Scaffold this active site. Structure first.
Site, mmCIF file in Angstrom:
data_model
loop_
_atom_site.group_PDB
_atom_site.id
_atom_site.type_symbol
_atom_site.label_atom_id
_atom_site.label_comp_id
_atom_site.label_asym_id
_atom_site.label_seq_id
_atom_site.Cartn_x
_atom_site.Cartn_y
_atom_site.Cartn_z
ATOM 1 C CD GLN A 139 -2.831 0.978 2.454
ATOM 2 O OE1 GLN A 139 -3.895 0.939 2.401
ATOM 3 N NE2 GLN A 139 -2.693 1.848 3.227
ATOM 4 C CB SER A 166 5.561 0.525 4.581
ATOM 5 O OG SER A 166 4.667 -0.310 4.646
ATOM 6 N N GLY A 188 2.914 -6.280 6.409
ATOM 7 C CA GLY A 188 3.446 -7.113 6.096
ATOM 8 C C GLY A 188 3.923 -7.410 4.653
ATOM 9 C CB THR A 189 2.772 -6.432 1.159
ATOM 10 O OG1 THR A 189 1.735 -7.496 0.975
ATOM 11 C CG2 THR A 189 3.342 -6.667 -0.355
ATOM 12 C CB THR A 201 -1.651 -0.144 9.368
ATOM 13 O OG1 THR A 201 -0.614 -0.883 8.886
ATOM 14 C CG2 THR A 201 -1.960 1.630 8.916
ATOM 15 C CG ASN A 232 1.033 8.855 -0.296
ATOM 16 O OD1 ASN A 232 2.299 9.103 1.180
ATOM 17 N ND2 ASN A 232 0.092 8.330 -0.389
ATOM 18 C CD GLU A 274 28.333 11.656 -10.614
ATOM 19 O OE1 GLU A 274 27.654 11.398 -11.944
ATOM 20 O OE2 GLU A 274 27.400 12.293 -10.770
HETATM 21 N N1 LIG Z 1 3.335 7.716 4.083
HETATM 22 C C1 LIG Z 1 2.318 6.915 3.898
HETATM 23 N N2 LIG Z 1 2.431 5.333 4.495
HETATM 24 C C2 LIG Z 1 1.596 4.390 4.586
HETATM 25 C C3 LIG Z 1 0.983 4.828 3.648
HETATM 26 N N3 LIG Z 1 0.084 3.352 3.379
HETATM 27 C C4 LIG Z 1 0.679 2.494 4.697
HETATM 28 N N4 LIG Z 1 1.957 3.119 5.391
HETATM 29 C C5 LIG Z 1 2.155 3.248 6.527
HETATM 30 O O1 LIG Z 1 2.699 1.791 6.111
HETATM 31 C C6 LIG Z 1 2.592 0.801 6.725
HETATM 32 C C7 LIG Z 1 1.756 -0.267 6.917
HETATM 33 O O2 LIG Z 1 2.600 -0.740 5.946
HETATM 34 P P1 LIG Z 1 1.179 -1.070 4.770
HETATM 35 O O3 LIG Z 1 1.967 -0.468 2.974
HETATM 36 O O4 LIG Z 1 -0.347 -0.358 4.378
HETATM 37 O O5 LIG Z 1 1.303 -2.370 4.534
HETATM 38 P P2 LIG Z 1 1.387 -3.807 2.967
HETATM 39 O O6 LIG Z 1 2.740 -3.269 2.540
HETATM 40 O O7 LIG Z 1 0.249 -3.452 2.479
HETATM 41 O O8 LIG Z 1 1.591 -5.163 3.953
HETATM 42 P P3 LIG Z 1 -0.026 -5.765 4.015
HETATM 43 O O9 LIG Z 1 -1.114 -5.203 3.773
HETATM 44 O O10 LIG Z 1 0.109 -6.388 5.509
HETATM 45 O O11 LIG Z 1 -0.044 -7.171 3.265
HETATM 46 C C8 LIG Z 1 1.697 2.220 8.803
HETATM 47 O O12 LIG Z 1 3.297 2.287 8.828
HETATM 48 C C9 LIG Z 1 1.049 3.322 7.376
HETATM 49 O O13 LIG Z 1 0.730 4.460 8.147
HETATM 50 C C10 LIG Z 1 0.636 6.042 2.241
HETATM 51 O O14 LIG Z 1 0.386 5.889 1.447
HETATM 52 N N5 LIG Z 1 1.977 7.104 2.912
HETATM 53 MG MG LIG Z 2 -1.931 -4.085 2.885
#
Ligand SMILES: Nc1nc2c(ncn2[C@@H]2O[C@H](COP(=O)(O)OP(=O)(O)OP(=O)(O)O)[C@@H](O)[C@H]2O)c(=O)[nH]1
Ligand SMILES: [Mg+2]
Ligand SMILES: Nc1nc2c(ncn2[C@@H]2O[C@H](COP(=O)(O)OP(=O)(O)OP(=O)(O)O)[C@@H](O)[C@H]2O)c(=O)[nH]1
Ligand SMILES: Nc1nc2c(ncn2[C@@H]2O[C@H](COP(=O)(O)OP(=O)(O)O)[C@@H](O)[C@H]2O)c(=O)[nH]1
Ligand SMILES: Nc1nc2c(ncn2[C@@H]2O[C@H](COP(=O)(O)OP(=O)(O)O)[C@@H](O)[C@H]2O)c(=O)[nH]1
Ligand SMILES: [Mg+2]
Lengths: 430, 129, 428, 430, 427
Positions: free
Chosen positions: A11, A133, A137-138, A172, A221, A247
Site C-alpha cells: 500500500q 513501508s 507485511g508486504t 496500522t 504522499n 554518484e
Molecule cells: N506515507 C505513507 N505511509 C503509508 C501509506 N500507506 C501505508 N503507510 C504506512 O505503512 C505501514 C503499513 O504498511 P502498508 O504499506 O499499508 O502494508 P502492506 O505493504 O500493504 O502490507 P499488508 O497489507 O500487510 O500485506 C504503516 O506504517 C502505515 O502508516 C501511504 O500511503 N503513505
Molecule cells: Mg496492504
C-alpha cells in the site's frame, strides 16, 4: 540510455508511486494517457511505444488487489500497461512471514518476469528504486524476498530504497517494529542505499508548515512525492550539475552497511498565505531538525557526507556562498576522517506542484541527502520497541506459525545491534 | 734587436718572420670499430625500449585480472545469495508443513476419541433396564 | 617536431581544454568557424603545431574530446568555439565514471578506451612529424583521472618515443565535488610519476586562493578559476606556437626542465593576476617568480629551490631590460636555486601578449617546493585510508587494497626525492 | 689547385655559413645567382663552376631538422647552392649529444658522406675540410663528432679544421650544453687538426661595446664571425703568402697535436654609424688587448707557442715591423722556452669587405691574430667546472643513457679534458 | 480477505444471530426481502463481507442457522428479517440437546453435524477469498456450547488456514436455565482455548447488571439483554463492514489483538448504554473504556491491564478530537496498559453510527482482568465437581471424568497465564 526501474511494493509503496508518477507527468508535460505534445532525459524513467506513448519504467506490486485497483481504474489507468500492475488475492496481514514466505512466494516469479521484461528494454540500466513501508507485511516481507531475488538475477546492479519508517500517529499494526527489524536484517546486504522517510516527521511538517489539522495519506504522499521527485530530478533532467545512481552511492556511502542518508527538504510553504526564499535561506533550512524527513538530532552526531540537490532559479555562485557559510558552522560537525563532504547538483526546473494541492509554487527548492551518525537514533527507537515485545515473545507465534524460527528474530536483532555499534565506531575520532 | 726573415711574395700577398729572441731550449680509427660502437649503443636503446614495453604489457595483464576479479566476485555473490535463499525457503516450507500436520493430527485424535465416547453411550443405552 | 595531438578528458579536462582552444584561437586570429582573419605573420608561422588545415582556408584543432558521459560534450559543442572542433573527434560513453578512479581506469573507461585510441591514431597517422600528446584532465574525479591515466599508458605503449605532457588539475576541499578526491588524486599521481614526461600541476587550492585573496572575489566560480588556467596555458605554450629559439618543442623543453625522470612536475607562475571583469613593468614581472601569490600550484617557491625555470615574457618590452632583470632576480635570490645546475633559468620574449593583456610573465618552475602539494594530498589520503573509508567502491571494481598502499608509497617517495635534491650541496 | 670543402652542421654551423658565403660572394664579385661578371683565379679553391658559367660553393649544409636549411633553399642565395648540397632530416637531436651521435645522426651520416665524396671527386688537389658547428647543440656536438670519425677513415691524410661555437649563457639554448661540449671535444680531439673556437659571450660583448648594439641577435654575431672567418680563409681564396695551404695552419700554429686551439683576436670592429682611419700601430696594439679576443681568457696568465698576424688592406711591412718593435718594448709577450719569441706576418692586399647595410664600417686596414697560447685552457676549465657540478649529481644523464650512451662515456670524456688541462699546464712549464 | 461465513447454533446463538442480521441489514440499507434501498455508497462498498448477491438485486446473508430443536428456528423464520435467510441454510434436528454439552458435542450433535457441514462447505467454496468463520452461541446450554464447539473443530479440520471467530455467551446464576451451566461452560472454554483465534466474551452476568442497575429494568428479559449484544456486535464488526485502514479483516485484527495464542478472549465495551425503548461527547465516550459499568464481560478493566485495545468511534465527530482524547486516556491511565507492548491501542472512526444512535464507542479489549470471568466459572465448576454432582449426565453420554479434570486444568492455566502477564514488568 541510463534507465532506472521503479518497483512500488505494498500500500505505502503503491500510494507513494501514484503521487510520484502523477508529479513526473506534470514535470515532463506527459498527459494521463501517456501522450506528450528539448531535454529528453525523462527517457531514463519513461519508455516510448511506436505510437508516441510514454510509459513508466515501473512495476506496482501488492499482495491484495484493492490499492492497485485504484490505479487500474483511476486518472492514470491508460499510463500503465495492465501487465505492470501486479496483485494477488490475499494480503500478508501485517506479517513479514506471510510477505516473505507463505503469500509472497506465490507471486514473486510473476513480478520478476515483469521486471525482466522492463530490463530487456534498457540499453544502460543504472538499477532499481524500490518504494515500500517497513511496517506492512508486504512492504517488509515481500520487499525482502524481492531484494534477495534481484541480487540473484542482477548481482551487484544498484538497488536503492525509499522506505517508510513507522509512526504511531498513522501506524496500522502493533508488530511494525518486528516487520522493520526482520526486513532491515534481510535487506541490509542486498541494498546499496536506503532513503528512510519517517511518517511522524512528514505528519508534523504537514501540521506545522502546511496548517493541516489531521493529515491524511494524500497529504503525506504528495509531500513525499515532492522529495522523491527532487532525488530523481537529476536523473530525469539535465541541469547545471547532475548526479546519477552511482554518484549518490559513492558520495553518500562510506561502508556498505552505513547506507541510510537523512533526507531534508526546503521550502515547504502552504498554498494559502501569499508570501521568495533565497539560496542561502533554503540551504540554512536543510540543517534545521524541523525540515528533516526522519526524527533525529544531527547535533548528537557527525556528518560523513552531504549532497545538495537544488532545483529552479539557482546559480552555482549563490550555492557555493551558501555552502561556505555552512562550512563555518561549529554546530555542524564532520567526522575527522572526512576532508570534504559536499556534492552539489543543480537543475533548472522549479518544483512543480499538483494543481489543487497543499504546497505553494516556489522559485527554488533544495533536497539535502546527508550521512549523519544521528540516524542511528531512529534505529535505537525501533530496536527498543522490538526488545520490549520480544522479551515476552509477544506476537512471535504469528511468525512461527508461518514457518519462521525464533532464531531469525535473534539474528535480525543482533544484526541491528551491530549496525548501532557501526554508527558509534564510524563517528569516533581517529 | 729583431731578426727579419723573408718567407713568401705573391700576387695579392707578402709574408715574413720576425724574431725577437731565439728559444731558451734548442729543440688511426677504423670503420669496423665505429660500427661496433654504434651497434652496441643501438642495442642498449632497443633493450630499454623493450623493458618499457614489457612493463606496459604487465599492466595490461593486471587490468584484465581486475576486470576478471570483479566479474568473479559478482558471480560468487550471486551463487551465495541463491543458495542462502533456497535454504531459507525450504526450511520455512518444512516448518510450516510440520505445524500444519501437527494441528491436523490433534483434530484427528479428537475424532477417534469422539467415536470412543459414542461407543460408550451406545452400550449404556439399550444394554440397560 | 611539428604536430601536437591534444586530448581533453572528463568534465574539468573538457572545460579547461575548451578555454585553451578559445584563448589560442583568439591569439592566432582564428574565429569560431576556423577562419583566419588576423593581421600578423607570426600568428600563422607555427599554426600547424595545434591546427590541421581542412577544406578551403579553415583551421581545425587537432583535439580529441573525451568523456564517459554526454552532457559535457554537449556543453562544449554549445560553447563559444564549440563548432570549431571536428565532430567525429567527440568520443563519449553513456554510463559515467561515478567520481570513481577505478571505474574510469578499469571498468567503464576500458570499454571506451579503444574508441578514443582510434580517433587519436587517425590524428597521429596524419602527422608529418608528431611531437607527442597533451592531456587536460582533473585528478579528483573519475573520467579525467582514471580514464585519462589509462589513456596515457595505452598511448605510451603505442607511441613510446613521443612526449607525453599533461595539465593536471589537483583537487582541493575549497572547490570540491566528491568525498573520494584524495583517493582518485593519489591513484593518478602514481600513474603520472611513471608515465608522463612533463606534468603542469594546476592546483584548485591555489586558483581559489588567488581569486579570493588577490582578486577579492568573495565567491569564486569555475569560470573565475578557468580564467587563470587559460592565461597560464596560453603562457606555458607560447614557445611551442610562435617562432623562437628556446624550448620550441616538447622534447627540447623536457631536456631543459627535467634533470631526473620522476621530477617532472611543474609549478606554473603567472603575472599579472586578473579577473574576467578587468600597469606592470619588467622589474615588477620578474619579481613574481618567487611570489607564492602568483603560483598556480599551492606551494611557496621560497620554501624550496628551483632545479630549473623557463621564464616567458610577452608584449612590447625591452629584451635588454628583461635580460638585466632576470640576472638580478637570480643573483639576489641565489639561495632559491640549486647551485649544482648552472644557468638553470632560460628566458624567452614574445611580441604577442596573451588575450586581454598588454604585458605578461609566465614561469615554468621545477621547484623542490612542489613536495608541499604532494604532502597535502597524502595527508588527506591517509586520513581516509587509515579508516578504509569508501574503499568498497574501489575494491568492488576488482581493485586490491595493495594498489592504494603502492600509490601512497610512490607518492611519498616522490616527496622524499624532492627533499633529497633540496638539501643537496655542491660540495658532496 | 688547393680546393677546400666546407661542412656546416646544425643551426649555428648553417647560419654562420650563410654569413661566410655571403661575404665570400661580395669579396669575389659573385652575385647571389652564382654569376660573376669578370683579380686572380684562387677563388676556385672555394667555388666550383658549372656549364652555365655559375660559381657554386664547395660546401655541404647539414641539419637533423629542416627549418634553418629551408631558409637557405628559399632565400636570397637559393640559386647559389644546388639542392643536393642542402641536407636535412626530419627530427632534430633535442640538445642531446647522444641523440645526434647515436640515434638520429647514424641514419643520415651515409648520405652526407656521399655528398662530400661527390664534392671531393671534383677536386684535383683536395686540401681538406672546414667544419662549422656549435659545441652546445645536439647536432653541432653529436653529428659533428660522428662525421669527423668517418672523415678520418675516408680521408686519412686530409686536414680537418673547425670553427666551433663555445657556449655562452646570454644566448644559450640548453642547460646541458657543458655536457655536449665535453662529449664532442673528447670524440673530436684525435680527428681535428686545428680548431678556432668562438665564445658567444666574447662576440656578444664586442657587438654591445664596439657596435653599440643593445641586444645582439644571431645576425649581428654571425656577420662579425664571418669577418674573422674571411680573414683566416683569405690566403686560400686569394693568391696570398702566409697560410697558403691548410697543412700550413698546423705547421704555423700547432706544435703538439692535442693543443690545437688557437686564440683568435680581430681589429678594428667599428660601427657603421665620421672616423679617422686607424693606423697599423693602432690595429696591432688592439691585437694584444683581451677585449678584442674571440674567446674570454687572460693571455698574461699563459705563454705563447706561435703567433700569426694576418693583415689585410692598405698595410706596409715597414709599419708592421715598427708596430711589433714598440709592443715588445712595453709588453712582456712570454713565449714557451722551446719556441722562439717572434711572429709570422702575412699581408693580404685585398681590402676588408663588409656587407652593405650591416653593422660594421668599411675600414682601410684590419688584422687577425691567431695565437696558440696556454691561456685558452681557462675556457676549458670554465666548461669542465659546469660539467662537474651537474655530473656529481648525475643531473640530466638519463637523457643520454636513454639514447644508448653509457655513464662511462661521461667519465672518459671528462678524464680526456682533465688530461687536456694538464697538457696545457705541462707545455707552459718553462 | 473478503467473505465471512456466519453460523448460529442453539437457542441463544440463533436469537443473538437473528438480531445481528437485522441490525447490520438496517445499517447497510437492506430491507427484510434482501433489497437495497439505502442512500450511501459506504453501505455497499464491503456488502460482500457478509452478504451474497442472489438472482436480481437481492442480498442474502451468508449465514447457516443450526439447532437440535426446531422451535427457535421457526421463531427466527417468523421474526423481523426471517425471510432474508436462504431457506436451505436452516439445518435443524428434532431431538434437542437437553442443555447438556455432551449431547451436543458427541451424541445428537454428531448426528446432525454432517448436514451442517454440507451447507457451510457450499457457502465457503463459493467465496472468492474466504476470511473465515464467525459463530454465535451460548456456553451454558447444550447445542450452542457442545455442537457449536464440535462444528468449530470440524470446520478447522477442513479450513485450517482460515480465521475462526466466536461470540460466546457466558452463563450467570442471575439468568440461569440449568444447574449444570458451569460444566457446559468449562467444557466449551477448553475447546475455545485450543480451537478459536478470537472469542468475544458476552457475559450474561454483565448484560443482566447493565439492564438492572443502569437501565433500571426490574426484571430484564432476553430481549433486553440481546439489545446490548446487537449494539456490541454492530460495534465490533464496524471495521470488517465499512471502508477503513485498521483491522479491516479477521486476520489483521487477530495479529493486532492476540500476543499469545491462548489469550484470545476479548472483553467488549460499549457506550452509550441504552434500552430498546430509551448524543454523548467525545471525552465522555473515551472515558467509558475503563468503566466496569460499560463492559459486556463482568470484569473491571481497572482490576487488570490491557495487553491490546481496538477503539471504534461511530457517528459525525472530529477525528482530531478523538485522537487527542485517546492519547489523554492512555497517558492518564498508563498503569492500566502493559508497558512492554508499545502503541497497543488502535483507534478507528466511522461516519455511520449504529442503528438507533447518533454517536457511539466500542472497545475490543484484550485485558488481563478477563481472568475474573474465568475464575467465576471455575469456582462454580469446582463447587459441583468436588462432589461429582450431575456427573452421570455426562458419563451417561459416553464421557469420561478425565475430560472434566482436563477442561478444568486448561481453564485454570488460562487464569494463571493472564495473571503472569498482568504482573510482568518491562525491567
Ligand atoms: N506515507 C505513507 N505511509 C503509508 C501509506 N500507506 C501505508 N503507510 C504506512 O505503512 C505501514 C503499513 O504498511 P502498508 O504499506 O499499508 O502494508 P502492506 O505493504 O500493504 O502490507 P499488508 O497489507 O500487510 O500485506 C504503516 O506504517 C502505515 O502508516 C501511504 O500511503 N503513505
Ligand atoms: Mg496492504
Ligand atoms: N654564434 C652563433 N651561435 C649560435 C647560432 N645558432 C645557435 N648558436 C649557439 O649554438 C648552441 C645551440 O646549438 P644549435 O647549433 O642551435 O643546435 P643544433 O646543432 O641545431 O642541434 P639540435 O637543434 O639540438 O639538433 C647555443 O650555444 C647557441 O647560442 C648562430 O647562428 N650563431
Ligand atoms: N579548475 C577547474 N576544476 C574543475 C572544473 N570542473 C571540475 N573541476 C575539479 O575537478 C574535480 C572533479 O573532477 P571532474 O573532472 O568533474 O570529474 P570527471 O568528469 O569524472 O573527470 C574536482 O577537483 C573539481 O574541483 C573546472 O571547470 N575547472
Ligand atoms: N443473552 C442471551 N442469553 C441467552 C439467550 N437464550 C439463552 N441464553 C443463555 O444461554 C444458556 C442456555 O443455552 P441455550 O442457547 O438456550 O441452549 P442450547 O439451545 O442448548 O444452545 C444460558 O446461559 C441462558 O441464559 C438469549 O437470547 N440471549
Ligand atoms: Mg637545431
Amino acid at each position: 540510455m541510463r534507465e532506472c526501474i521503479s518497483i512500488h511494493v505494498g500500500q505505502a509503496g503503491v500510494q507513494i508511486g501514484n503521487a510520484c508518477w502523477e508529479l513526473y507527468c506534470l514535470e515532463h508535460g506527459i498527459q494521463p494517457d501517456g501522450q506528450m505534445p528539448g531535454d529528453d532525459s525523462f527517457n531514463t524513467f519513461f519508455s516510448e511505444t511506436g505510437a508516441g506513448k510514454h510509459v513508466p519504467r515501473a512495476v506496482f506490486v501488492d499482495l491484495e488487489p484493492t490499492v492497485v485497483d485504484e490505479v487500474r481504474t483511476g486518472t492514470y489507468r491508460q499510463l500503465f500497461h495492465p501487465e505492470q500492475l501486479i496483485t494477488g488475492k490475499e494480503d500478508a496481514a501485517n506479517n513479514y512471514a506471510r510477505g516473505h514466505y507463505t503469500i509472497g512466494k506465490e507471486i514473486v516469479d510473476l513480478v520478476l518476469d515483469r521486471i525482466r521484461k522492463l530490463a530487456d528494454q534498457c540499453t544502460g540500466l543504472q538499477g532499481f528504486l524500490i518504494f515500500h513501508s517497513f511496517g506492512g507485511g508486504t512492504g517488509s516481507g515481500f520487499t525482502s524476498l524481492l531484494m534477495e531475488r534481484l541480487s540473484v538475477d542482477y548481482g551487484k546492479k544498484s538497488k536503492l530504497e525509499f522506505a517508510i519508517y513507522p509512526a504511531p500517529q498513522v501506524s496500522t499494526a502493533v508488530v511494525e517494529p518486528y516487520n522493520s527489524i526482520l526486513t532491515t536484517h534481510t535487506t541490509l546486504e542486498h541494498s546499496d542505499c536506503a532513503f528512510m522517510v519517517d511518517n511522524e516527521a512528514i505528519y508534523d511538517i504537514c501540521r506545522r508548515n502546511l496548517d493541516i489539522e489531521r493529515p491524511t495519506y494524500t497529504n503525506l504522499n504528495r509531500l513525499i512525492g515532492q522529495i522523491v521527485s527532487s532525488i530523481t530530478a537529476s536523473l530525469r533532467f539535465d541541469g547545471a550539475l547532475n548526479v546519477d545512481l552511482t554518484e549518490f552511492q559513492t558520495n553518500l556511502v562510506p561502508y556498505p552497511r552505513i547506507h541510510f542518508p537523512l533526507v531534508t527538504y526546503a521550502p515547504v510553504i502552504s498554498a494559502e498565505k501569499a508570501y521568495q526564499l533565497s539560496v542561502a535561506e533554503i540551504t540554512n533550512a536543510c540543517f534545521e531538525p524541523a525540515n528533516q524527513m526522519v526524527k533525529c538530532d544531527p547535533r548528537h552526531g557527525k556528518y560523513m557526507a552531504c549532497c545538495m540537490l537544488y532545483r529552479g532559479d539557482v546559480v552555482p555562485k549563490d550555492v557555493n556562498a551558501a555552502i561556505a557559510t555552512i562550512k563555518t558552522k561549529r554546530t555542524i560537525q564532520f567526522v575527522d576522517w572526512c576532508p570534504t563532504g559536499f556534492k552539489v547538483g543543480i537543475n533548472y526546473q522549479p518544483p512543480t506542484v499538483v494543481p489543487g494541492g497543499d504546497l505553494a509554487k516556489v522559485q527554488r527548492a533544495v533536497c539535502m541527502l546527508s550521512n549523519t551518525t544521528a540516524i542511528a537514533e531512529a534505529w535505537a527507537r525501533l530496536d527498543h520497541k522490538f526488545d520490549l515485545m520480544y522479551a515476552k515473545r509477544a506476537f512471535v507465534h504469528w511468525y512461527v506459525g508461518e514457518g519462521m524460527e525464533e532464531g531469525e528474530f535473534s539474528e535480525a536483532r543482533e544484526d541491528l545491534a551491530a549496525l548501532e555499534k557501526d554508527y558509534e565506531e564510524v563517528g569516533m575520532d581517529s | 734587436d729583431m731578426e727579419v726573415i723573408e718567407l713568401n711574395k705573391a700576387t695579392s700577398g707578402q709574408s715574413w718572420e720576425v724574431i725577437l729572441k731565439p728559444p731558451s731550449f734548442d729543440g688511426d680509427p677504423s670503420l669496423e670499430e665505429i660500427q661496433k660502437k654504434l651497434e652496441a649503443a643501438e642495442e642498449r636503446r632497443k633493450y630499454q625500449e623493450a623493458e618499457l614495453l614489457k612493463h606496459l604489457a604487465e599492466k595490461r595483464e593486471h587490468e584484465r585480472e581486475v576486470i576478471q576479479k570483479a566479474i568473479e566476485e559478482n558471480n560468487n555473490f550471486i551463487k551465495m545469495a541463491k543458495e542462502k535463499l533456497a535454504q531459507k525457503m525450504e526450511s520455512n516450507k518444512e516448518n510450516r508443513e510440520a505445524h500444519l500436520a501437527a494441528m491436523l493430527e490433534r483434530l484427528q485424535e479428537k475424532d477417534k476419541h469422539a467415536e470412543e465416547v459414542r461407543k460408550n453411550k451406545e452400550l449404556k443405552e439399550e444394554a440397560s433396564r | 617536431m611539428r604536430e601536437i595531438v591534444h586530448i581533453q578528458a572528463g568534465q574539468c579536462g573538457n572545460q579547461i581544454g575548451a578555454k585553451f582552444w578559445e584563448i589560442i584561437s583568439d591569439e592566432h586570429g582564428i574565429d569560431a568557424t576556423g577562419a583566419y582573419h588576423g593581421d600578423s605573420d607570426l600568428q600563422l608561422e607555427r599554426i600547424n603545431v595545434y591546427y590541421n588545415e581542412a577544406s578551403g582556408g579553415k583551421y581545425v584543432p587537432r583535439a580529441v574530446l573525451v568523456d564517459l558521459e554526454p552532457g559535457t560534450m554537449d556543453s562544449v559543442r554549445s560553447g563559444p568555439f564549440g563548432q570549431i572542433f571536428r565532430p567525429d573527434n567527440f568520443v563519449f560513453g553513456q554510463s559515467g565514471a561515478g567520481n570513481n578512479w577505478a571505474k574510469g581506469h578499469y571498468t567503464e573507461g576500458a570499454e571506451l578506451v579503444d574508441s578514443v585510441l582510434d580517433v587519436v591514431r587517425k590524428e597521429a597517422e596524419s602527422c608529418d612529424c608528431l611531437q607527442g600528446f597533451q592531456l587536460t584532465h582533473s585528478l579528483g574525479g573519475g573520467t579525467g583521472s582514471g580514464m585519462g591515466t589509462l589513456l596515457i599508458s595505452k598511448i605510451r605503449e603505442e607511441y613510446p618515443d613521443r612526449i607525453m605532457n599533461t595539465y593536471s588539475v589537483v583537487p582541493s576541499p575549497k572547490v570540491s565535488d566528491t568525498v573520494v578526491e584524495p583517493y582518485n588524486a593519489t591513484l593518478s599521481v602514481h600513474q603520472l610519476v611513471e608515465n608522463t614526461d612533463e606534468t603542469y600541476c594546476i592546483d584548485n587550492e591555489a586558483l581559489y586562493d588567488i581569486c579570493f585573496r588577490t582578486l577579492k572575489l568573495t565567491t569564486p566560480t569555475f569560470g573565475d578559476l578557468n580564467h587563470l588556467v587559460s592565461l597560464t596555458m596560453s603562457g606555458v605554450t607560447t614557445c611551442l606556437r610562435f617562432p623562437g629559439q628556446l624550448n620550441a618543442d616538447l622534447r627540447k623543453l623536457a631536456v631543459n626542465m627535467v634533470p631526473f625522470p620522476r621530477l617532472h612536475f611543474f609549478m606554473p607562475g603567472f603575472a599579472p593576476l586578473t579577473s574576467r571583469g578587468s600597469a606592470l613593468t619588467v622589474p615588477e614581472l620578474t619579481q613574481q617568480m618567487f611570489d607564492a601569490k602568483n603560483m598556480m600550484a599551492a606551494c611557496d617557491p621560497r620554501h624550496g629551490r628551483y632545479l630549473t625555470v623557463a621564464a616567458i615574457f610577452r608584449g612590447r618590452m625591452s629584451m635588454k631590460e628583461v635580460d638585466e632583470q632576470m640576472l638580478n632576480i637570480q643573483n639576489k635570490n641565489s639561495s632559491y636555486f640549486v647551485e649544482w645546475i648552472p644557468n638553470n633559468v632560460k628566458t624567452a620574449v614574445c611580441d604577442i601578449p596573451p588575450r586581454g593583456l598588454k604585458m605578461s610573465a609566465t614561469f615554468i618552475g621545477n621547484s623542490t617546493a612542489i613536495q608541499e602539494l604532494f604532502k597535502r594530498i597524502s595527508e588527506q589520503f591517509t586520513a581516509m585510508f587509515r579508516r578504509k573509508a569508501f574503499l568498497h567502491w574501489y575494491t568492488g571494481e576488482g581493485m586490491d587494497e595493495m594498489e592504494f598502499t603502492e600509490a601512497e608509497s610512490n607518492m611519498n617517495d616522490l616527496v622524499s626525492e624532492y627533499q633529497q635534491y633540496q638539501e643537496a650541496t655542491a660540495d658532496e
